[PDB]
Amino acid sequence: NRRPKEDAFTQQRLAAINPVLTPRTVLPLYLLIAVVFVIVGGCILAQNSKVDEVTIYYQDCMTNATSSWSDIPSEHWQFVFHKYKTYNTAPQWRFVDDESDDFTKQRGTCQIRFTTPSDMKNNVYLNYVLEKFAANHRRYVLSFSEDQIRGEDASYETVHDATGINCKPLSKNADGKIYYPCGLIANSMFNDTFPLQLTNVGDTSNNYSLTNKGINWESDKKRYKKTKYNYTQIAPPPYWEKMYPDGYNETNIPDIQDWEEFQNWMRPGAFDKITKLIRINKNDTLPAGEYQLDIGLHWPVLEFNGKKGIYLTHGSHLGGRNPFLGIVYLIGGCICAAMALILLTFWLFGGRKIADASSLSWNMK
Amino acid sequence: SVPLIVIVIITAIKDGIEDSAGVTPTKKSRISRELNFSVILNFVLLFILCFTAGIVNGVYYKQKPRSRDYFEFGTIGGSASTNGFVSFWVAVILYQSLVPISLYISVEIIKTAQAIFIYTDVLLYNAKLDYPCTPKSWNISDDLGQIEYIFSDKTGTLTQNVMEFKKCTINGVSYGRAYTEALAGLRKRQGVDVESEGRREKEEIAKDRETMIDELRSMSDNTQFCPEDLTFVSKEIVEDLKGSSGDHQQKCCEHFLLALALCHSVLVEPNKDDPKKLDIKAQSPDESALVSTARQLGYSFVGSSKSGLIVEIQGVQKEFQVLNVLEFNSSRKRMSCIIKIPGEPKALLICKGADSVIYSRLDRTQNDATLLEKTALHLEEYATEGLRTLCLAQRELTWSEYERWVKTYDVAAASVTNREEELDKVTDVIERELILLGGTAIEDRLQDGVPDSIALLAEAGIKLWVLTGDKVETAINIGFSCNVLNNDMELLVVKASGEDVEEFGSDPIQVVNNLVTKYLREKFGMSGSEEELKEAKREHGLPQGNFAVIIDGDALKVALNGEEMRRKFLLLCKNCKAVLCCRVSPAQKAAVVKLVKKTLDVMTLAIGDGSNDVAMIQSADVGVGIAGEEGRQAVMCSDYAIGQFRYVTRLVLVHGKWCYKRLAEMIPQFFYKNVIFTLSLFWYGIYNNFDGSYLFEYTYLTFYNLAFTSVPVILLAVLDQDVSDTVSMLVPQLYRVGILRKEWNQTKFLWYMLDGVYQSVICFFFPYLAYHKNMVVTENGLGLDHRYFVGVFVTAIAVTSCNFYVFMEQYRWDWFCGLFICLSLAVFYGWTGIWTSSSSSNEFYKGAARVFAQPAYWAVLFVGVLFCLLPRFTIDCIRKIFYPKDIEIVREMWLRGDFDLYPQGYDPTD
Ligand SMILES: *[C@@H]1O[C@H](CO)[C@@H](O[C@@H]2O[C@H](CO)[C@@H](O[C@H]3O[C@H](CO)[C@@H](O)[C@H](O[C@@]4(O)[C@H](O)[C@@H](O)O[C@H](CO)[C@H]4O)[C@@H]3O)[C@H](O)[C@H]2NC(C)=O)[C@H](O)[C@H]1NC(C)=O
Ligand SMILES: *[C@@H]1O[C@H](CO)[C@@H](O[C@@H]2O[C@H](CO)[C@@H](O)[C@H](O)[C@H]2NC(C)=O)[C@H](O)[C@H]1NC(C)=O
Ligand SMILES: *[C@@H]1O[C@H](CO)[C@@H](O[C@@H]2O[C@H](CO)[C@@H](O)[C@H](O)[C@H]2NC(C)=O)[C@H](O)[C@H]1NC(C)=O
Ligand SMILES: Nc1ncnc2c1ncn2[C@@H]1O[C@H](COP(=O)(O)OP(=O)(O)O)[C@@H](O)[C@H]1O
Ligand SMILES: *[C@@H]1O[C@H](CO)[C@@H](O)[C@H](O)[C@H]1NC(C)=O
Ligand code: ALF
Ligand SMILES: [Mg+2]
Ligand SMILES: [Mg+2]
């Protein structure tokens, strides 16, 4: 009726295990964790020591030399292979101009020629790398609309005088028509074209096939929603006037169904370095030989010494060539082993019985 | 606003259902102020962080014009105005995280949690009295581990109010012979034989009882015959009633008995089964014992009549009445009775109390000089063997005296508007004539399991103070009966009375000053006024120099008048265990309590049982009540209550220490677990001219420190068992940790602040350097390459690191803590993998499929947990090897099997 209930929990006597720090217990756990962790570190290092990588920077292949085949400066191309150390094979670059574009500041085609000494394991990725691109500015990164997710077309008030997220900096123009890809994040998109195939100078009868289908997963496929653009209130971004001198008509609307790379740029990079996938090949085993690429030069980058290049790789269980994980694994293994040996020595050197009643802070007297 | 109030109401409702303006009742503790200082330190760290962010956010005037302007073209202008605007609102919207949100409520959450766990202690549950420890104030409980001083009222705490009749002084003759435990203790400490002599004394007392009952049966027949209820054993007085020691002895002895039977405030009620049987219950145990023994010896006071007393002597009935009564007062320390008997009509004013209050006022001109000395010696030995002194003084009023008394009463009855002062003064000034006629002797029994408990507290390194008002000799004898007052120590008595008045009789101030200077110069070295007090307050107390100090009422009364006197008294009271004070009112001892609290502040316990103890508890660091006498009302004006004193041994020593250690360890852990969350953001915001990059999710503002990893810190705060209760009870030396405050300091604050900074360094720079080279680690597809996903990495690392760290410091790996640790990690994983599959994650949207499936996630959390746990675990090992603290030593030795023969929850009272 009133007597308190008796139990282990109400007295805090639940069963427990109290380990203490004694060499009989300390040593085995260290030895086992150390051996297994160093073993897996060696395994991942061995895995990482196999994949290849090539990268070529071409941000300044428009005034470095003339319209002939000149060598790219060494500060732009870096090659890593698992069977060659001094594999220099300096790639060549050429530029071809075209006066069909009024924007003479940055126009033309840059062609590059590189080579590979070995075949490939049927897995090729080609990415475009950007260096020193400030995408972490709040006004820049907090400038995009929510309706573009579903293709909806709301009013200018809902996109200009909205909450902290809106297309505030570039909401309205002189005409007043809103922008479907509003916001500086979309307006500051990389503006380059990449070939859908790779020429093979060795045997031109079979070039190397590429595609831009499958950069990202079906997330965008699970993001796509039916749209209702009014085809009259949508205006090109002010930085897209060269792209759309006539503006959007009832045919040139930017679709999302197939070529999602137009909007794969939605989320910016994690930090200053910028790299996104542009070409994938899973079917064709790439053999050795010399190869050549061609890239447009529409996107201006020299206005602030920004850098831009390409990067071809293979990937692995842990990505591309980056020995940082192996470095940390080895550092941790060495530190843990060193601590284990240090305390083993201190047990040997300071050999004493574990439970010493005289050592208590009240046994002086 | 509303959420805080409603959550407070709901948690109060939970407290109420589990138990069966503002919050703080009176005042907080030192921990509250230290917490305020620590929060101010956190605030100033946030402020300097904001300053070092804002200087860079604005020093870019001479920096290169990067692409921050090539894309925007929205040059607002106004560098002195608009840029400062941006800085101020960025600061006020992005630097609101380091301030503790839930700490201000979590502290009392933890306090009430551990308090209700205290309340549900079935081992703290009384069996006979049936009164468990019921907390009143849920706020102040952390001080119970740092207690270093106990203030005790021996009227009800040290000894129960169960009276026993031993002797009685009538006309200078002591009647009554028995053998109590106090007598045995005195004999054994005197070095004389106690086993054979004790048995001989016991059989002699048995023979005395036999001859007493035989003579009682032979001479007459009494109305209180009883085979087991009889407690009268004194044979000298049973025969000295009629004519044994002369007719004058008879006259004086029955006169004394009648005077005593006319002096009491006791309620007498009949027994329900038998009306004749006595069921005497009242508020004064001593008077109840006196009337009970009067009934046993022949003066049977049966019946409940307030307008007169009806007493029978072997059947002969007689009725009377007491005219005026003045009950015991906290200042009077006596009871007054005015009776008037018609014929030679005569009035009698009788004052009942202790020796100090009765000998203070008497007829100096008219003294017997024979009964006074006899009574003085009688009471001296009575206190020597520990008999509570109860003396009565008589004052006769003749016909002229009765008439002038009536005139004074009728002329002084017209006083209104606080007449009590005038009445007290007039009675004191006109009541200068008193004559003593003797007194009785009563003794008190102790509690259950006092000596072992107080001895183990003393061995715990804590000092206790005990208070009374009767006298010193009974007090020291009660201390000697238990083991709080051992031998091998002399008395630092500073009494301004006694034989010292014969040779150096003067006014008390200078004599007590001379003696305390002697003590402060050539007995102990603290001669000074400032340096010694500061040294004492810096040393924070330690039991050393096992002596005993005694003070008298006059010296304590005059001590409140002198600053030098109070500081020198505080210096000299640094004895080891023994401190005793007598002849003092509750106000005076409350004043000395607050004196010792102010200077060299130390948490003080205020255990008490009575009416004078309320002043102790109302002015104390913490108090505990006792359900004893009518002063049980003190428990409402208290902090904790318990049926008997013997339970508090488990409270302060065991549970209070756990409270102190758990709080003092978990508060720094909570401060550690918060700084990394803001510091990672600070490092991520170094770029973009400190524009204010917001790395984490908009939903991470709360769930990081409110849902996911807030469980194990409070769990360790409340559900920790530092060591088994039994081994702690057998070995209480670990309690020195609360004595020396070896777990609460600013050095620990800074050490964990630096630890948090270093942990944040690892947590931020592991995934960042995992992406420095090519950040193409996807194993399929593109990869993450976004601030939110690297945020997922870093928050996962931080939360698992903090949870494993508090798991590591957790002293009791049980079936309870690890389960909720695993549950916290599981719910973190589940929320991060489920909420990402929703429209509310419009941008992020892909944590589960794009992060967890990646082997890089596990490969990086492995190195994160190693580089978190291993360095500080090795620091823990090296501290436990080169500086092995006592706690882990006793833990491992009892785990090894040394202390396993004893069961769990064993008691010494079994
Ligand atoms: C490829 O993608 C890039 C990325 O945006 C595009 O670059 C952008 O190109 C536009 C077009 O010129 C450019 O807009 C402004 O450029 C000039 C200086 O930046 C500015 O003088 C120019 O203004 C005029 O030329 C316009 O006729 C009109 O604005 O009136 C003024 C005054 O009469 C006149 O000078 C124009 O407003 C963007 O600045 C540029 N982006 C960046 C970051 O520099 C490029 O157009 C895309 N090309 C294709 C083919 O899609
Ligand atoms: C592989 O790519 C090259 C590069 O364009 C192709 O070469 C072109 O071939 C067509 C007709 O065969 C010519 O009209 C072009 O002038 C060639 N271009 C260059 C730059 O030489 C080649 O045909 C492709 N091979 C296959 C099998 O498609
Ligand atoms: C690799 O092979 C697959 C399947 O043969 C190709 O996928 C097809 O691609 C075409 C054009 O991109 C689409 O029209 C088909 O619908 C795809 N088939 C399926 C089942 O999805 C893929 O394009 C090839 N990639 C390369 C680089 O050769
Ligand atoms: N009901 C009472 N009747 C007569 N004397 C009392 C009564 N209660 C207490 N006293 C006197 O007061 C003394 C008790 O001292 P103590 O209990 O330490 O202080 P206080 O009683 O003021 O709390 C005893 O010596 C006793 O003579
Ligand atoms: C629409 O504009 C695009 C380019 O902006 C052009 O290629 C296309 O022919 C135009 N179509 C119509 C119907 O105007
Ligand atoms: F019996 Al009292 F104070 F009078 F404890
Ligand atoms: Mg009382
Ligand atoms: Mg009271």
XYZ file of C-alpha atoms in Angstrom, chain B residues 378-742:
365
model
C 25.291 15.764 43.679
C 24.832 17.320 40.240
C 28.597 17.345 39.618
C 28.886 13.581 40.013
C 25.531 13.088 38.253
C 26.984 14.819 35.200
C 30.210 12.857 35.731
C 28.397 9.541 35.252
C 26.074 11.244 32.789
C 22.810 12.097 34.535
C 20.855 14.968 32.999
C 20.596 17.653 35.680
C 17.038 18.709 36.577
C 17.049 21.074 39.563
C 14.127 22.865 41.222
C 14.251 26.095 43.242
C 11.553 27.213 45.682
C 10.444 30.688 46.761
C 7.977 31.186 49.613
C 5.377 33.972 49.635
C 3.712 34.821 52.954
C 0.419 36.654 53.522
C 1.951 40.096 52.988
C 3.974 38.679 50.096
C 0.834 37.105 48.621
C -1.034 40.411 48.933
C 1.754 42.367 47.238
C 1.913 39.677 44.539
C -1.820 40.100 43.922
C -1.447 43.889 43.816
C 1.466 43.678 41.369
C -0.486 41.238 39.195
C -3.575 43.457 39.060
C -1.531 46.612 38.401
C 0.681 44.998 35.720
C -2.226 43.286 33.928
C -3.265 46.566 32.255
C -0.313 46.298 29.846
C -1.272 45.805 26.185
C 0.536 46.025 22.810
C 3.318 43.488 23.377
C 3.122 43.371 27.173
C 5.485 40.378 27.149
C 8.598 42.569 27.335
C 7.306 44.512 30.341
C 6.199 41.315 32.087
C 9.561 39.623 31.488
C 11.488 42.629 32.801
C 9.318 43.092 35.898
C 9.402 39.375 36.740
C 13.184 39.301 36.319
C 13.767 42.382 38.477
C 11.365 41.369 41.274
C 12.215 37.634 41.135
C 15.658 37.962 42.737
C 14.843 35.668 45.696
C 15.137 31.913 45.171
C 15.976 28.918 47.356
C 16.896 25.488 45.996
C 15.412 22.288 47.418
C 17.153 19.734 45.191
C 16.508 17.875 41.966
C 16.215 14.545 40.189
C 18.437 12.450 37.923
C 17.448 11.173 34.472
C 19.482 9.460 31.753
C 19.006 9.003 28.014
C 19.598 6.024 25.736
C 21.504 6.292 22.469
C 20.306 5.462 18.959
C 21.017 2.178 17.155
C 24.497 1.772 15.685
C 25.912 5.152 16.721
C 29.563 4.317 17.569
C 30.467 2.414 14.397
C 28.759 4.970 12.152
C 30.333 8.023 13.765
C 33.715 6.268 13.844
C 33.595 5.505 10.127
C 32.568 9.103 9.400
C 35.527 10.279 11.487
C 37.788 7.879 9.581
C 36.306 9.343 6.384
C 38.204 12.545 7.199
C 35.204 14.731 8.054
C 34.706 16.872 11.156
C 31.459 17.171 13.105
C 30.181 19.609 15.718
C 27.669 18.698 18.420
C 25.552 21.143 20.423
C 23.541 21.197 23.652
C 22.570 23.571 26.434
C 22.415 21.468 29.598
C 26.129 21.270 30.516
C 29.493 19.897 29.407
C 30.144 16.890 31.655
C 27.031 15.021 30.521
C 27.922 16.009 26.957
C 31.477 14.672 27.142
C 30.210 11.528 28.868
C 27.704 10.869 26.076
C 30.549 11.381 23.623
C 32.664 8.909 25.603
C 29.879 6.305 25.686
C 30.096 6.265 21.906
C 33.511 6.428 20.220
C 33.453 9.971 18.825
C 35.445 11.122 21.889
C 38.432 8.809 22.235
C 41.300 9.140 24.710
C 44.805 10.555 24.110
C 43.524 14.137 23.873
C 43.246 16.915 26.441
C 40.396 19.399 26.777
C 40.741 22.963 25.478
C 38.103 24.142 27.929
C 37.583 27.912 28.061
C 34.920 27.956 30.776
C 34.598 31.308 32.548
C 33.459 29.616 35.764
C 34.348 26.795 38.131
C 37.375 26.533 40.382
C 39.180 29.090 38.203
C 37.048 31.783 39.855
C 38.637 31.005 43.240
C 42.142 32.188 42.301
C 41.546 34.422 39.245
C 37.935 35.497 39.721
C 37.163 38.463 37.474
C 34.859 39.513 34.649
C 34.786 36.861 31.901
C 36.025 38.822 28.871
C 39.661 39.234 29.899
C 40.016 35.758 31.425
C 38.672 34.070 28.290
C 40.901 36.370 26.219
C 43.962 35.334 28.233
C 43.143 31.639 27.932
C 42.420 31.791 24.196
C 45.675 33.710 23.686
C 47.441 30.945 25.614
C 45.816 28.367 23.332
C 46.569 30.389 20.183
C 50.226 30.989 21.133
C 51.631 28.046 23.118
C 49.062 25.315 22.436
C 48.737 25.790 18.671
C 50.551 28.222 16.425
C 48.176 30.641 14.699
C 49.045 33.886 16.505
C 47.710 36.582 14.201
C 44.643 38.104 12.627
C 44.896 37.938 8.816
C 47.594 35.515 7.640
C 46.275 32.531 9.595
C 42.672 33.071 8.484
C 43.742 33.233 4.834
C 45.896 30.126 5.298
C 42.927 28.273 6.800
C 40.583 29.348 4.003
C 43.197 28.339 1.410
C 43.869 24.932 2.969
C 40.117 24.096 2.928
C 40.213 22.030 6.116
C 41.862 18.742 7.096
C 41.453 16.528 10.189
C 44.694 16.802 12.167
C 45.719 17.368 15.764
C 43.170 15.169 17.512
C 42.258 17.221 20.602
C 39.042 18.527 22.172
C 37.878 22.111 22.719
C 35.199 23.278 25.165
C 33.516 26.686 25.336
C 31.112 28.139 27.898
C 28.038 30.295 27.441
C 29.545 33.635 28.467
C 32.543 33.363 26.136
C 30.313 32.419 23.200
C 27.969 35.305 24.032
C 30.825 37.818 24.092
C 32.497 36.261 21.032
C 29.876 37.841 18.754
C 31.027 41.300 19.902
C 34.631 41.097 18.679
C 36.035 40.825 15.166
C 39.371 39.689 16.578
C 37.481 37.345 18.883
C 35.546 35.759 16.020
C 38.628 35.309 13.846
C 40.644 33.813 16.711
C 37.752 31.493 17.604
C 37.549 30.359 13.978
C 41.302 29.749 13.982
C 41.281 27.754 17.229
C 38.276 25.639 16.185
C 40.454 23.878 13.592
C 40.596 20.844 15.879
C 40.364 17.373 14.373
C 36.961 16.010 15.394
C 35.890 17.299 18.811
C 34.021 20.595 19.240
C 31.523 21.164 22.055
C 29.469 24.175 23.147
C 26.942 24.549 25.976
C 24.963 27.198 27.887
C 23.952 28.890 24.620
C 20.601 29.861 23.130
C 19.667 28.776 19.589
C 20.170 32.363 18.405
C 23.763 32.417 19.678
C 24.675 29.089 18.092
C 22.949 30.154 14.866
C 25.158 33.247 14.943
C 28.286 31.140 15.379
C 27.075 28.820 12.593
C 26.748 31.735 10.192
C 30.118 33.064 11.397
C 31.868 29.800 10.539
C 29.942 29.731 7.252
C 30.940 33.241 6.135
C 34.697 33.064 6.686
C 36.486 30.038 5.266
C 33.200 28.933 3.739
C 32.644 25.171 3.905
C 29.457 23.207 3.273
C 27.803 22.569 6.639
C 25.316 19.901 7.683
C 22.521 20.932 10.055
C 21.213 17.662 11.469
C 18.927 18.392 14.401
C 15.953 17.156 16.411
C 14.037 19.695 18.472
C 12.730 23.246 18.425
C 16.046 25.090 18.790
C 17.370 23.391 15.631
C 15.171 25.400 13.243
C 17.603 28.311 13.519
C 20.354 25.862 12.572
C 18.616 24.636 9.424
C 17.306 28.007 8.233
C 20.896 29.322 8.293
C 22.955 26.434 6.936
C 24.394 25.059 3.725
C 22.179 21.961 4.023
C 20.086 20.416 6.775
C 18.579 17.041 7.622
C 15.631 16.523 9.958
C 14.798 13.853 12.534
C 11.310 12.566 13.379
C 11.759 12.514 17.136
C 10.240 14.885 19.688
C 7.641 17.614 19.127
C 10.367 19.516 17.268
C 9.748 17.219 14.314
C 8.081 20.299 12.793
C 11.656 21.294 11.905
C 11.613 18.880 8.951
C 9.233 21.084 6.944
C 11.651 23.984 7.446
C 14.504 21.737 6.321
C 16.010 20.104 3.229
C 15.913 16.376 4.025
C 14.213 14.186 6.606
C 14.954 10.734 7.993
C 13.473 8.567 10.722
C 16.711 8.058 12.649
C 20.220 9.483 12.597
C 21.893 6.153 11.804
C 20.678 6.309 8.195
C 22.494 9.554 7.335
C 25.750 7.575 7.336
C 24.676 6.043 4.033
C 23.339 9.342 2.688
C 26.209 11.819 2.950
C 29.091 9.345 2.735
C 27.886 7.114 -0.099
C 25.247 8.824 -2.221
C 26.375 12.423 -1.716
C 29.909 11.599 -2.838
C 28.526 9.899 -5.953
C 26.444 13.010 -6.619
C 29.440 15.312 -6.289
C 31.731 13.239 -8.497
C 29.090 12.612 -11.170
C 28.205 16.298 -11.454
C 31.801 17.544 -11.328
C 32.758 15.111 -14.078
C 29.745 15.415 -16.383
C 29.555 19.240 -16.452
C 33.046 19.424 -18.045
C 31.985 16.620 -20.394
C 28.961 18.639 -21.513
C 31.164 21.683 -22.066
C 33.551 19.494 -24.076
C 30.791 18.069 -26.264
C 29.522 21.491 -27.419
C 32.606 23.468 -28.481
C 33.532 21.236 -31.442
C 30.169 21.814 -33.137
C 30.754 25.571 -33.382
C 34.514 25.330 -33.926
C 34.130 23.219 -37.072
C 31.821 25.920 -38.433
C 34.383 28.563 -37.497
C 37.099 26.837 -39.519
C 34.765 26.248 -42.456
C 33.894 29.954 -42.426
C 37.489 31.138 -42.857
C 36.997 31.395 -46.632
C 34.560 33.613 -48.599
C 35.880 36.690 -46.754
C 34.057 35.288 -43.703
C 30.727 35.708 -45.480
C 29.290 33.191 -43.015
C 29.300 29.791 -44.707
C 26.713 27.493 -43.092
C 28.233 24.034 -43.469
C 25.753 21.846 -41.592
C 22.105 21.124 -42.302
C 19.502 23.678 -41.298
C 18.121 20.862 -39.114
C 21.453 20.209 -37.362
C 21.014 23.341 -35.226
C 19.093 21.261 -32.667
C 19.225 17.484 -33.143
C 23.008 17.363 -32.719
C 23.009 18.492 -29.083
C 19.338 17.907 -28.219
C 18.369 14.440 -29.491
C 21.318 12.307 -30.557
C 24.213 12.626 -28.092
C 22.539 14.324 -25.108
C 21.565 10.922 -23.648
C 24.864 9.411 -22.424
C 26.195 12.526 -20.669
C 23.146 12.846 -18.424
C 23.041 9.046 -18.145
C 26.528 9.070 -16.636
C 25.469 12.065 -14.547
C 22.594 10.176 -12.899
C 23.029 6.404 -13.442
C 26.702 6.118 -12.448
C 27.989 3.841 -9.689
C 31.557 4.957 -9.021
C 32.174 1.963 -6.742
C 30.153 -0.727 -4.992
C 28.277 0.552 -1.955
C 29.609 -2.151 0.375
C 33.305 -1.645 -0.369
C 32.799 2.117 -0.150
C 31.240 1.632 3.291
C 34.124 -0.553 4.491
C 36.687 1.787 2.909
C 35.336 5.370 3.048
C 38.776 6.948 2.535
C 37.847 7.769 -1.065
C 35.582 10.447 0.417
C 38.720 12.574 0.812
C 38.056 13.477 -2.836
C 35.230 15.701 -1.619
C 37.397 16.993 1.218
C 40.208 18.242 -1.035
C 38.005 19.202 -4.028
C 40.277 17.252 -6.394
